[PDB]
Structure 1
Amino acid sequence: MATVLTKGEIVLFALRKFAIASNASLTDVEPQSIEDGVNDLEDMMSEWMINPGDIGYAFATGDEQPLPDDESGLPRKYKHAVGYQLLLRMLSDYSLEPTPQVLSNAQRSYDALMTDTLVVPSMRRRGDFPVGQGNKYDVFTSDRYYPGDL
């Protein structure tokens, strides 16, 4: 994609959005808070394979370790949602509580992500339900009664 999201960029976004490590609040950044953040992101993405479903995350192949310089594989349309969810999960490390505006932003981004993965399964006919004489089950098609399976 456009510039390719790395796993370190997402955790830096989350750290910046609450004024923990950025150049436009005071100063500073730590190296352990990065490994902790990246591991938290990996575990979150593992969990998301259940409720929100797969979104294309690129996991580490074999054991090794994630490393912040690895390519995430996510489209750029998801970074705000992922970053806000990660910030919500990792706020309590520093003993902080989110403000209402942060919660509102997180909910809006999550809703945008949810809208892009809908299915609406569209239930089918049963299998003992007849198909009428009107569509000529003898000659044109075969098998009067719907299959309703496959």
Structure 2
Amino acid sequence: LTKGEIVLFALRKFAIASNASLTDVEPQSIEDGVNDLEDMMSEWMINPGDIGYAFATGDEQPLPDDESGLPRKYKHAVGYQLLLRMLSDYSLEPTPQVLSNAQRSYDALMTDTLVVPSMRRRGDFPVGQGNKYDVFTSDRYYPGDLPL
């Protein structure tokens, strides 16, 4: 799943260019799309969380043929979002069907990264004599929150 494939999906879905169009977008435009994917992933490190994207090494510009490392399960979701971000570049506006597809793919991606933090006991809560803290277990109160 090279970075270039993700960019090609974005342009084909809104029809700007395709392996069919008599016309085609210049090479410079594709580089901007690869650079936009990297800003996308840099931001996605924060809100959606880490996914497994392999960023460029120190002091190399990203290349369209470079490996990305995201599994093909998340490909539709990553591609649809990028299209919305760079759609306005070509002076266009998205459609409700495209918006719904992107939203559904985003929910599908989010369903794969749940947390459910499952908060623990306070730390001063007593442990009853039913646990037999005298013999079987040393602690007479809950251990705490596992610091750092």
Aligned to 1:94: 90
Other structure's SS at 2:83 match: helix
Q: Deviations over 1:58-104 (max 9, x none)?
A: 00011111000100000000110000000000011101000000000
Change (3 A) 1:103 1:26: farther
- Aligned-residue RMSD, C-alpha: 1.1
> Cα distance, 1:8 vs. partner?
0.4
Gaps of 5+ in 1: none
Q: Deviations over 1:95-149 (max 9, x none)?
A: 1000000000000000000000001000000111001000100100011110122
Distance, in Å, in 2 between the alignment partners of 1:97 and 1:26 is 23
1:16 and 2:17 equivalent? Answer: no
Distance, in Å, in 2 between the alignment partners of 1:40 and 1:116 is 24
> Cα distance, 1:29 vs. partner?
2.9
**Count of residues in correspondence between the two structures:** 146
> Cα distance, 1:27 vs. partner?
3.8
Q: 1:81 aligns with which of 77, 80, 85?
A: 77
> Cα distance, 1:33 vs. partner?
1.0
> Cα distance, 1:28 vs. partner?
1.9
Change (3 A) 1:26 1:100: farther
Further displaced range: 86-95 or 19-28: 19-28
Other structure's SS at 1:28 match: coil
Distance, in Å, in 1 between the alignment partners of 2:94 and 2:131 is 62
Distance, in Å, in 1 between the alignment partners of 2:18 and 2:108 is 27
Q: Deviations over 1:36-58 (max 9, x none)?
A: 00000001101100000000000
> Cα distance, 1:24 vs. partner?
3.8
TM-score normalised over the length of structure 1: 0.94
Distance, in Å, in 2 between the alignment partners of 1:102 and 1:26 is 24
Further displaced range: 49-58 or 21-30: 21-30
Decide whether the 8 Å contact of 1:88 with 1:98 is kept in 2: yes
Change (3 A) 1:113 1:53: same
Percent identity, aligned pairs only, is 100
Distance, in Å, in 2 between the alignment partners of 1:63 and 1:90 is 25
Gaps of 5+ in 2: none
Runs of 4+ in 1 over 6 A off after TM superposition: none
